[PDB]
Amino acid sequence: ALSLDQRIQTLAYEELNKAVEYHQAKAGTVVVLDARTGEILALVNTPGRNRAVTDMIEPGSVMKPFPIAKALDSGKVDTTDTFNTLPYKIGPATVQDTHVYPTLDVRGIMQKSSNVGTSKLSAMFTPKEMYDFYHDLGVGVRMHSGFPGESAGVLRNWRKWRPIEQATMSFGYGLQLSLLQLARAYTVLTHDGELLPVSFEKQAVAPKGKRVIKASTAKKVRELMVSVTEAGGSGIAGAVDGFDVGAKTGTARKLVNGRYVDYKHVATFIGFAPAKNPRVIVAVTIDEPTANGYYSGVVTGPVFKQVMGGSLNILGVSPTKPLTN
Numbered sequence: 075a076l077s078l079d080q081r082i083q084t085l086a087y088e089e090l091n092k093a094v095e096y097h098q099a100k101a102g103t104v105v106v107l108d109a110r111t112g113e114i115l116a117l118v119n120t121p122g123r124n125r126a127v128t129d130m131i132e133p134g135s136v137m138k139p140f141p142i143a144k145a146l147d148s149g150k151v152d153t154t155d156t157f158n159t160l161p162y163k164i165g166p167a168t169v170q171d172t173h174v175y176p177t178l179d180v181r182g183i184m185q186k187s188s189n190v191g192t193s194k195l196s197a198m199f200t201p202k203e204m205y206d207f208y209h210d211l212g213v214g215v216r217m218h219s220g221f222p223g224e225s226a227g228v229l230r231n232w233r234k235w236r237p238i239e240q241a242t243m244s245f246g247y248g249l250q251l252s253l254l255q256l257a258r259a260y261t262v263l264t265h266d267g268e269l270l271p272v273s274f275e276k277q278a279v280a281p282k283g284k285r286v287i288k289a290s291t292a293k294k295v296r297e298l299m300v301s302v303t304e305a306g307g308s309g310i311a312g313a314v315d316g317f318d319v320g321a322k323t324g325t326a327r328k329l330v331n332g333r334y335v336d337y338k339h340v341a342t343f344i345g346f347a348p349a350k351n352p353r354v355i356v357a358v359t360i361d362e363p364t365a366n367g368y369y370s371g372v373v374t375g376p377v378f379k380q381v382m383g384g385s386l387n388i389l390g391v392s393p394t395k396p397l398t399n
């Protein structure tokens with residue numbers, strides 16, 4: 075009846091805890107979705123409540139593939155287009171990357187995780203168009219997974235938005251998602267641009283997605299995302315031997331009385347493989363690591379590596395390129 079694979083479940087548990095202990099972190103979560111059905115194959119939380127469904131976080135940089143997809147789907151951006159990625163101001167506040175480049179093409183924006191570049195891609199759409207796009211991805215939306223305490227997330231209405239909000243949401247702040255809503259949204263990337271329902275039951279009928287982007291655009295985005303796990307990309311720690319992996323890192327500062335603090339982070343890592351035609355999505359978040367680094371790449375990449383590499387094995391998926399080990 076249940077779609078949870080005990081072997082992936084066990085693997086996800088062990089590796090989650092090994093990372094949480096190692097990094098002296100408060101809490102953490104792993105979800106593993108079927109990339110074409112939305113079946114949950116694994117879902118684990120450090121002890122306590124089912125954080126995967128009940129808790130909402132700001133996605134940060136693991137949001138960025140979505141505005142990017144939107145740009146490309148519209149016809150207004152091509153994958154080769156170059157953008158000005160310098161710091162710029164919207165009223166008082168300033169939008170910037172942690173490493174400054176003067177320009178990046180779209181592929182640069184993904185591989186390096188450019189806040190500015192993502193917000194330049196966002197800025198070509200009306201508030202309504204971005205809202206509608208995030209809503210269609212399930213941001214702020216009940217999933218009816220069948221779990222109790224299901225968080226809807228938060229998606230403030232576009233009629234209310236200050237201009238800075240459009241921009242900050244495009245690179246992941248001022249909006250909130252359960253890790254499970256976030257994994258789900260990635261089915262748009264994996265299921266040829268159709269958002270899938272999520273369920274913990276084996277399903278007897280093909281599930282029907284809602285079309286959000288073209289099949290051609292998901293394909294292009296998945297290829298862009300391979301850059302994240304190769305040299306020059308922020309998720310190199312996440313690479314799995316034998317396979318190209320489309321992934322996205324995200325490190326977020328936390329909100330304490332509504333101001334962002336520089337001594338408290340949430341590390342996230344979501345990816346799928348094989349990149350060209352994925353079978354699986356793996357999502358990791360770890361909250362408030364205190365030892366042995368705080369970046370997505372070093373905190374959540376290794377966890378992802380082991381859960382993805384062990385899932386592909388367990389499901390009888392063969393390596394698509396030769397090992398270098």
Ligand SMILES: CC1(C)S[C@H]([C@@H](C=O)NC(=O)[C@H](NC(=O)N2CCNC2=O)c2ccccc2)N[C@H]1C(=O)O
Nearest residue numbers: 134135172187247308323324325326327334369370
């Ligand atoms: C370190 C990174 C490469 S920057 C980028 C990105 C997305 O996650 N993270 C940020 O832009 C994030 N900013 C952030 O939290 N806030 C909150 C409100 N405004 C704002 O920008 C940050 C975290 C740590 C140091 C510097 C910046 N991805 C990181 C990755 O891959 O771990």
